[PDB]
Design a binder for this molecule. Structure first.
Ligand SMILES: *C(=O)[C@@H]([C@@H]1N=C(C(=O)O)[C@@H](S[C@@H]2CN[C@H](C(=O)N(C)C)C2)[C@@H]1C)[C@@H](C)O
Length: 267
């Protein structure tokens, strides 16, 4: 019945903005879950950088890469929205600093470079996801081309459920060892682009790590988070939104509100 009411509220919240909300949330402490449209597909946008950072950390763990290796790119034409990589064009960044820049600032330069040299491109990223048992994720195109968010296009989509599951496996599970998992946890905690999303849905005492995405088309936006509540087991919250018209703008407020509803549903 708690479930059924949470769902009516998402239903209404989506009609209010003329769009389409996908929700999955997990209380790791009880196993309780809430999903609404949790098996529908939605554009990832930048949200895949969260996973991309994880794949980097898996390669570091496997000893294929070193976390402090220098990454030089002094002749690159840096993609738009490369706020961190721009400031070190001349000197390069450590692999680790670069990966975290990709997560924490949605830096497209960091993203595309990492995917070029270390990850085998979009197919390699899809391969990583498969390898932790995520069958829904697909990345098709590179950082700046994956944002078209066209209704009915499976390219560069996942589902709220798959995203949530993957996040749990990565941020809380055993894909990454204790040391490496903690690093990844801190990277998520230091996300700078999520203040109006899932962060705005919880008491300010709770610690959140997250990755956002904003397609800038079809008013498509999303956020997924691990949440550490006061003296309580972790929650995972996954929220994805699209809108009916190409020109529509995304809605932080809707995302924050669907998060509130989702957290209550599993509470
Ligand atoms: C991917 O989705 C795109 C980038 N990732 C974003 C995000 O994480 O939500 C968006 S919004 C971006 C956050 N930094 C900018 C900012 O601080 N404001 C202008 C205030 C906006 C971002 C476009 C993109 C890289 O493809």
């Amino acid at each position: 019945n708690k479930s059924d009411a949470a769902a009516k509220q998402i239903k209404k919240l989506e009609e209010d903005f003329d769009g389409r909300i996908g929700v999955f949330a997990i209380d790791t402490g009880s196993g309780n879950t809430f999903g609404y449209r949790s098996d529908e597909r939605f554009p990832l946008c930048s949200s895949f950088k969260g996973f991309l950072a994880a794949a980097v950390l898996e390669r570091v763990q496997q000893k294929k890469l070193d976390i402090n290796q220098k990454v030089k790119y002094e002749s690159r034409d840096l993609e738009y929205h490369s706020p961190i990589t721009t400031k070190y064009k001349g000197s390069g960044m450590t692999l680790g600093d670069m990966a975290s820049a990709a997560l924490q600032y949605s830096d497209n330069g960091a993203t595309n470079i990492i995917m070029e040299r270390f990850l085998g491109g979009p197919e390699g990223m899809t391969k990583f996801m498969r390898s932790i048992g995520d069958n829904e994720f697909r990345l098709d195109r590179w950082a700046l081309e994956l944002n078209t968010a066209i209704p009915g296009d499976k390219r560069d989509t996942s589902t709220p459920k798959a995203v949530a599951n993957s996040l749990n496996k990565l941020a809380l599970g055993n894909v990454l060892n204790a040391k490496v998992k903690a690093i990844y946890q801190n990277w998520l905690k230091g996300n700078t682009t999520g203040d109006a999303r899932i962060r705005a849905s919880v008491p300010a005492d709770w610690v959140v790590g997250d990755k956002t995405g904003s397609c800038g088309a079809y008013g498509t936006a999303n956020d997924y988070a691990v949440i550490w509540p006061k003296n309580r087991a972790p929650l995972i919250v996954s929220i994805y939104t699209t809108r009916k018209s190409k020109d529509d703008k995304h809605s932080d407020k809707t995302i924050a509100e669907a998060s509130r509803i989702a957290i209550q549903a599993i509470d």
